[PDB]
């Protein structure tokens, strides 16, 4: 019925908001800038795998009555839960750095260069603890508020895409054909980055926590099956919305960015009066390395400054939404792995601090290209940390002790094993690419130790899963 779906509605907008974090925005920015339409099939495969993973998360959370954090606390011994919890902590703080840089760039774009970066970060942390102050008369649930916000930003991106008017002929091969002849290693780097960024590792915990919101009676199996199917339908709808918005941004950015040289863009939109044109043109015909600031200024110079202001508004909305979803996710990590049970205080304090330090340092002593590189490294780190969040769920839905009936079938088991070996191989190849890239020989030992710890934790989790397999 429509009323039952309306009652079950509310989470899907939340995971979609998490999917539309500013880190995803920068990642698809760079992907469209460099490879263009050749990586859309990567986006499709990553999105469908994320949908499968969140289906598993919703299934586990609804059926067991507790989030995945509680079950890993119940199962694993002390040291593995501690290490894994620090893993989600690192992933979530990386996401926080992503969204704070996004908000800072958006505020820079609103100010038209008048307000510097430190002003942006201070005002966004002020707004964050203003949201904390909102507890004065807090009776809110955020679902309608942030559905309105996501619809707003979706309408902005859709209007930008439609006024761009792309042609779907190339989109056919981009979406359908799973290959990329003629591209190179940076294309692989951005593909891995988009794969990691589209599937936020913390979203598994986030959904496994929000499942409790609806009243589920675990005694009756038909009711929990209906709840699971409703949650799957809602997740499918949310993922479809996320993918269509990503399709819009992919098409427009690939059409407006591919084989575009710096001096050509400068000549095209030098008749206008942005006054930000200085950075774009180093008087050479080469690929235009573009961040959110440069992307917005280029869109405004090609189509009109309205494009820029609305783009920055969408970026600010995405940053606020991602900040909120990170706060909720991290609170649930606290209650799952330590049962610390705070109310939005300690998590937000630690996250905003661990974000403000590096970004304030990079704003004081580095330029915006360093910010773009830092976000690249952040979303690469998110990709590297993804298996540490996709394997525990695989294990915990593997064994039948929690789910005698609602276990994993043979087809799901083998498919999930295939994806887990695929992602582990991807991480191995990426770290192999990273090994010869160290400028200083002193980092060899640190990189080797970090890789050894990563492989050891991965092999321990694989041993646990094969025991559960």
Author numbering: 54 to 522
What do the authors of the reporting publication say about this deposited model?
Iron and manganese are essential nutrients whose transport across membranes is catalyzed by members of the SLC11 family.
As in case of NRAMP1 the low yield of the protein in detergent solution has complicated sybody selection, we have attempted structure determination of this paralog without fiducial markers by combining 57’783 micrographs from five datasets. These data have allowed us to identify two distinct conformations of the transporter in the same sample. One structure reconstructed at a nominal resolution of 3.9 Å is equivalent to the conformation observed for DMT1, as illustrated in the RMSD of 0.5 Å obtained from a superposition of Cα-atoms. Whereas one of the structures obtained for NRAMP1 (NRAMP1occ) closely resembles the occluded conformation obtained for its paralog DMT1, a second population of particles reside in a distinct conformation that is distinguished by an outward movement of α-helix 1a and concomitant changes of α4 and 5 leading to the dissociation of tight contacts between α1a, α5 and α8 and the consequent opening of an intracellular aqueous path towards the binding site. The correspondence of equivalent structures of the two human SLC11 paralogs to an occluded state is illustrated by the inaccessibility of the region harboring the conserved ion binding site from either side of the membrane. With respect to their conformations, the two human paralogs presumably display intermediates on the transport cycle, which in case of the occluded structures of DMT1 and NRAMP1 would be placed between outward-open and inward-occluded conformations found in the prokaryotic transporter DraNRAMP, where the intracellular gate precluding access to the metal binding site has closed while the extracellular gate has not yet opened.
